[PDB]
PDB file of C-alpha atoms in Angstrom:
ATOM      1  CA  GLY A  33       0.024  -0.011  -0.003  1.00 34.77           C
ATOM      2  CA  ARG A  34       2.863   2.414   0.846  1.00 31.69           C
ATOM      3  CA  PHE A  35       4.394   1.710  -2.630  1.00 28.24           C
ATOM      4  CA  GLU A  36       0.914   2.232  -4.172  1.00 28.70           C
ATOM      5  CA  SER A  37       0.654   5.536  -2.312  1.00 31.02           C
ATOM      6  CA  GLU A  38       3.829   6.925  -3.757  1.00 31.60           C
ATOM      7  CA  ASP A  39       5.312   7.724  -7.144  1.00 31.24           C
ATOM      8  CA  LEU A  40       7.449   5.292  -9.285  1.00 29.52           C
ATOM      9  CA  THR A  41      10.731   6.580  -7.633  1.00 27.77           C
ATOM     10  CA  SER A  42       9.608   4.673  -4.489  1.00 27.64           C
ATOM     11  CA  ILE A  43      10.450   1.371  -6.156  1.00 29.83           C
ATOM     12  CA  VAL A  44      13.814   1.385  -4.554  1.00 29.57           C
ATOM     13  CA  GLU A  45      12.258   1.879  -1.047  1.00 25.86           C
ATOM     14  CA  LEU A  46       9.704  -0.858  -1.778  1.00 26.39           C
ATOM     15  CA  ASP A  47      12.561  -3.220  -2.808  1.00 25.85           C
ATOM     16  CA  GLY A  48      14.482  -2.376   0.356  1.00 25.20           C
ATOM     17  CA  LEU A  49      11.338  -2.937   2.585  1.00 25.99           C
ATOM     18  CA  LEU A  50      10.726  -6.396   0.859  1.00 28.42           C
ATOM     19  CA  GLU A  51      14.344  -7.283   1.447  1.00 25.78           C
ATOM     20  CA  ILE A  52      13.984  -6.472   5.129  1.00 24.87           C
ATOM     21  CA  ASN A  53      10.681  -8.522   5.349  1.00 22.91           C
ATOM     22  CA  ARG A  54      12.477 -11.396   3.642  1.00 24.73           C
ATOM     23  CA  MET A  55      15.282 -11.164   6.202  1.00 21.85           C
ATOM     24  CA  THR A  56      12.758 -11.082   9.070  1.00 24.05           C
ATOM     25  CA  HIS A  57      11.068 -14.127   7.643  1.00 26.48           C
ATOM     26  CA  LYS A  58      14.356 -16.052   7.278  1.00 25.87           C
ATOM     27  CA  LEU A  59      15.252 -15.189  10.860  1.00 24.46           C
ATOM     28  CA  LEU A  60      11.752 -16.233  12.166  1.00 22.87           C
ATOM     29  CA  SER A  61      11.755 -19.648  10.164  1.00 25.89           C
ATOM     30  CA  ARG A  62      14.524 -20.902  12.234  1.00 29.27           C
ATOM     31  CA  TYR A  63      12.108 -21.755  15.108  1.00 28.08           C
ATOM     32  CA  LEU A  64       8.740 -21.105  13.711  1.00 28.69           C
ATOM     33  CA  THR A  65       7.064 -22.618  10.453  1.00 30.69           C
ATOM     34  CA  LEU A  66       5.826 -20.071   8.067  1.00 32.53           C
ATOM     35  CA  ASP A  67       5.064 -20.285   4.308  1.00 35.08           C
ATOM     36  CA  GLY A  68       7.873 -19.394   1.796  1.00 40.69           C
ATOM     37  CA  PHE A  69       8.451 -15.684   1.386  1.00 39.25           C
ATOM     38  CA  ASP A  70       7.346 -16.077  -2.333  1.00 42.77           C
ATOM     39  CA  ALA A  71       3.892 -17.419  -1.291  1.00 43.10           C
ATOM     40  CA  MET A  72       3.256 -14.422   1.114  1.00 48.04           C
ATOM     41  CA  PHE A  73       4.579 -12.008  -1.313  1.00 45.22           C
ATOM     42  CA  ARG A  74       2.239 -13.304  -4.113  1.00 43.07           C
ATOM     43  CA  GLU A  75      -0.745 -13.503  -1.750  1.00 45.03           C
ATOM     44  CA  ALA A  76      -0.121  -9.870  -0.758  1.00 44.19           C
ATOM     45  CA  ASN A  77       0.335  -8.913  -4.412  1.00 44.77           C
ATOM     46  CA  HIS A  78      -2.740 -10.845  -5.505  1.00 45.21           C
ATOM     47  CA  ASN A  79      -0.596 -12.576  -8.167  1.00 43.02           C
ATOM     48  CA  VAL A  80      -1.371 -16.040  -7.038  1.00 40.96           C
ATOM     49  CA  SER A  81      -4.907 -16.009  -8.598  1.00 38.89           C
ATOM     50  CA  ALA A  82      -4.276 -13.282 -11.257  1.00 38.91           C
ATOM     51  CA  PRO A  83      -1.721 -13.097 -14.040  1.00 42.18           C
ATOM     52  CA  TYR A  84      -0.757  -9.612 -12.880  1.00 38.35           C
ATOM     53  CA  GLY A  85      -0.022  -8.444  -9.418  1.00 36.58           C
ATOM     54  CA  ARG A  86      -0.657  -5.039  -7.772  1.00 37.35           C
ATOM     55  CA  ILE A  87       2.984  -3.802  -8.313  1.00 40.38           C
ATOM     56  CA  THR A  88       2.892  -4.310 -12.067  1.00 38.09           C
ATOM     57  CA  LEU A  89      -0.488  -2.638 -12.267  1.00 37.83           C
ATOM     58  CA  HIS A  90       0.668   0.352 -10.323  1.00 36.88           C
ATOM     59  CA  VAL A  91       3.854   0.600 -12.386  1.00 43.57           C
ATOM     60  CA  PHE A  92       1.720   0.662 -15.570  1.00 45.59           C
ATOM     61  CA  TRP A  93      -0.595   3.256 -13.908  1.00 42.83           C
ATOM     62  CA  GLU A  94       2.200   5.486 -13.010  1.00 40.79           C
ATOM     63  CA  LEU A  95       3.805   5.090 -16.467  1.00 39.24           C
ATOM     64  CA  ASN A  96       0.578   6.072 -18.147  1.00 39.44           C
ATOM     65  CA  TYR A  97      -0.213   9.053 -15.921  1.00 36.13           C
ATOM     66  CA  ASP A  98       2.710  10.666 -14.082  1.00 33.34           C
ATOM     67  CA  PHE A  99       6.021   9.433 -15.611  1.00 33.36           C
ATOM     68  CA  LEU A 100       5.700  10.009 -19.458  1.00 32.43           C
ATOM     69  CA  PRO A 101       4.088  13.544 -19.342  1.00 35.63           C
ATOM     70  CA  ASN A 102       6.364  14.877 -16.520  1.00 37.17           C
ATOM     71  CA  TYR A 103       9.997  13.493 -17.009  1.00 36.68           C
ATOM     72  CA  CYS A 104      12.345  14.801 -19.693  1.00 35.91           C
ATOM     73  CA  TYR A 105      15.133  12.615 -20.707  1.00 37.67           C
ATOM     74  CA  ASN A 106      18.774  13.479 -20.640  1.00 39.95           C
ATOM     75  CA  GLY A 107      21.056  11.383 -22.940  1.00 37.65           C
ATOM     76  CA  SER A 108      24.215  12.550 -21.512  1.00 36.39           C
ATOM     77  CA  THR A 109      23.596  11.258 -18.085  1.00 36.30           C
ATOM     78  CA  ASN A 110      20.913   8.727 -19.147  1.00 39.77           C
TER      79      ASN A 110
ATOM     80  CA  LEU B1394      -3.742 -40.174  22.362  1.00 38.89           C
ATOM     81  CA  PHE B1395      -5.759 -42.680  20.169  1.00 38.92           C
ATOM     82  CA  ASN B1396      -8.456 -40.175  19.488  1.00 43.47           C
ATOM     83  CA  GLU B1397      -6.232 -37.343  18.488  1.00 42.20           C
ATOM     84  CA  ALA B1398      -4.046 -39.575  16.315  1.00 42.30           C
ATOM     85  CA  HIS B1399      -7.256 -41.021  14.639  1.00 44.69           C
ATOM     86  CA  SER B1400      -8.340 -37.456  13.875  1.00 44.45           C
ATOM     87  CA  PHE B1401      -4.810 -36.860  12.535  1.00 45.93           C
ATOM     88  CA  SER B1402      -5.146 -39.968  10.322  1.00 48.53           C
ATOM     89  CA  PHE B1403      -8.503 -38.652   8.968  1.00 48.74           C
ATOM     90  CA  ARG B1404      -6.797 -35.331   8.110  1.00 48.09           C
ATOM     91  CA  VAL B1405      -3.804 -37.110   6.468  1.00 48.81           C
ATOM     92  CA  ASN B1406      -6.235 -39.336   4.359  1.00 51.54           C
ATOM     93  CA  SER B1407      -8.235 -36.399   3.104  1.00 53.51           C
ATOM     94  CA  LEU B1408      -5.228 -34.386   2.208  1.00 51.40           C
ATOM     95  CA  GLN B1409      -3.706 -37.469   0.314  1.00 52.39           C
ATOM     96  CA  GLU B1410      -6.893 -37.643  -1.707  1.00 54.75           C
ATOM     97  CA  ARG B1411      -6.609 -33.912  -2.315  1.00 55.92           C
ATOM     98  CA  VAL B1412      -2.853 -34.237  -3.347  1.00 56.81           C
ATOM     99  CA  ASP B1413      -3.505 -37.116  -5.725  1.00 55.65           C
ATOM    100  CA  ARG B1414      -6.416 -35.185  -7.318  1.00 51.03           C
ATOM    101  CA  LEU B1415      -4.251 -32.098  -7.640  1.00 49.30           C
ATOM    102  CA  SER B1416      -1.323 -34.043  -9.197  1.00 50.17           C
ATOM    103  CA  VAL B1417      -3.568 -35.695 -11.750  1.00 51.71           C
ATOM    104  CA  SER B1418      -5.092 -32.157 -12.494  1.00 52.67           C
ATOM    105  CA  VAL B1419      -1.535 -30.573 -12.803  1.00 52.86           C
ATOM    106  CA  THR B1420      -0.182 -33.334 -15.120  1.00 51.84           C
ATOM    107  CA  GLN B1421      -2.725 -32.058 -17.844  1.00 53.95           C
ATOM    108  CA  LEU B1422      -1.918 -28.371 -18.076  1.00 53.20           C
ATOM    109  CA  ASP B1423      -1.086 -26.818 -21.549  1.00 52.53           C
ATOM    110  CA  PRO B1424       0.956 -23.606 -22.046  1.00 51.98           C
ATOM    111  CA  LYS B1425      -0.972 -22.859 -25.225  1.00 50.05           C
ATOM    112  CA  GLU B1426      -4.329 -23.314 -23.572  1.00 48.46           C
ATOM    113  CA  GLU B1427      -3.296 -20.393 -21.121  1.00 47.15           C
ATOM    114  CA  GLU B1428      -5.368 -17.204 -21.920  1.00 47.71           C
ATOM    115  CA  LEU B1429      -4.744 -13.943 -19.932  1.00 46.21           C
ATOM    116  CA  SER B1430      -7.581 -11.542 -19.541  1.00 48.61           C
ATOM    117  CA  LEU B1431      -6.313  -7.917 -18.806  1.00 45.46           C
ATOM    118  CA  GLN B1432      -9.856  -6.745 -18.000  1.00 44.19           C
ATOM    119  CA  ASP B1433     -10.556  -9.592 -15.612  1.00 45.02           C
ATOM    120  CA  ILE B1434      -7.299  -9.180 -13.752  1.00 46.58           C
ATOM    121  CA  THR B1435      -8.807  -7.237 -10.753  1.00 47.01           C
ATOM    122  CA  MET B1436     -12.473  -8.168 -11.533  1.00 48.34           C
ATOM    123  CA  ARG B1437     -11.270 -11.502 -10.214  1.00 52.87           C
ATOM    124  CA  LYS B1438     -11.816 -12.349  -6.458  1.00 53.86           C
ATOM    125  CA  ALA B1439      -8.445 -12.271  -4.555  1.00 50.91           C
ATOM    126  CA  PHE B1440      -7.280 -15.374  -2.812  1.00 53.16           C
ATOM    127  CA  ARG B1441      -6.644 -15.219   1.018  1.00 55.22           C
ATOM    128  CA  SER B1442      -5.099 -17.698   3.274  1.00 51.07           C
ATOM    129  CA  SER B1443      -6.761 -18.984   6.477  1.00 51.72           C
ATOM    130  CA  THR B1444      -6.212 -16.756   9.573  1.00 50.23           C
ATOM    131  CA  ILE B1445      -7.858 -18.900  12.287  1.00 52.03           C
ATOM    132  CA  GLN B1446      -6.546 -18.128  15.781  1.00 53.12           C
ATOM    133  CA  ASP B1447      -7.116 -20.381  18.776  1.00 51.00           C
TER     134      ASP B1447
END
């Protein structure tokens, strides 16, 4: 939800938070018994029962609305 | 102990039936049969895992 509530530039923050969550799951799995991180991630993204998850839909929405008509490319710095 | 283990045996047998059914279903999939509907992607009910707490 936090990723969906911010622009596309929050993708790095989302990736970092997902890595933190994966680390926490790995730490907790030593004693407890939880599902694989992939299963939880897909259930949260609703990608288990749908071809496309929430992340890709939000990326497409941002590309359509906020990215293309607001960002100007610079070939020197890419 | 016998009662609880017998309940566990019922659960194991039921899930074994489920597992063999799932395997025979999965061994029939076809990549070309797969069709992706962009419109139905969110019109589809989302799957949620059980969250029962004792």
